Amino acid sequence: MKVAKDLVVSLAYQVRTEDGVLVDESPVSAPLDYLHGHGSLISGLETALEGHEVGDKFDVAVGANDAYGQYDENLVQRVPKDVFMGVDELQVGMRFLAETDQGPVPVEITAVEDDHVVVDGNHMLAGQNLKFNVEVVAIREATEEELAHGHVHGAHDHHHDHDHDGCCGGHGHDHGHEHGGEGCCGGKGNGGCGCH
Incomplete structure (x- = not known):
């Protein structure tokens, strides 16, 4: 059989940008299982996985052509x-x-x-082709509900799903409150105050 759409497949893969940075890496002891073609990993990677082998490792380049740069x-x-x-x-x-x-x-x-x-x-925000190795571990098809929510053996068991709120992560609203720690003992006092 060959990996294809509508087929949960756990394949770990390490990605690295030409700049020498690692955006994400999946260890073999913990492969990410998901629906091939439509599950989560960028499509450029899913389609590239179609037709390969279970348990085989392969390298596929996908970033600005269809992944993060687009x-x-x-x-x-x-x-x-x-x-x-x-x-x-x-x-x-x-x-x-x-x-x-x-x-x-x-x-x-x-x-x-x-x-x-x-x-x-301008390509400054695009043309970001990244290189990452992928390794398929299994290839199975999901049931009607599994392909409905895009999950395999979970659906409802899956953790939450974009329900929390109040968190930000960005910055720029307020800055500079009390300079640093406590008021600190400084102010002024030239003349002497014991110095070197």
């Missing part, structure tokens, strides 16, 4: 100036407006290239 390939378009060379100013970086079938798509030349120019938005 680069928008529908916004990048390379075309020569033959379609436009009189916009009151043709230079790399300038902002242009292309009306593709998807509607009005704003573009911005970033660097002209032979054959045609290159226009795109």
Whole structure:
């Protein structure tokens, strides 16, 4: 059999960013069981797991192409100036407006290239391709209720589900209350006060 959608599969995997950082890692003694294709792990990883082997380890790259970056390939378009060379100013970086079938798509030349120019938005928040190894441990199908809530042998047994509140995690509301610890004994008193 081969791993596929609608099939709970516990596969541990370690992910690491090119910067040399580890976003998450699953040990073999504790594989994360979930519905393949639609369970939790980014789809780029689920689809890449389809057709592999139970108990086999494999490496799959998935981040900006379909995971955390989600680069928008529908916004990048390379075309020569033959379609436009009189916009009151043709230079790399300038902002242009292309009306593709998807509607009005704003573009911005970033660097002209032979054959045609290159226009795109900003990838600073995208193009984050990460590399992580995955290892399938089991492959089973969930029942109607298991695939309904997207869980395997649990559904109701599963812990809570986004029900708590009041927590923040961010910051910027209030800052600087009493400087530091107690008022501390400082204030002023030049002249002497026993010094070096």
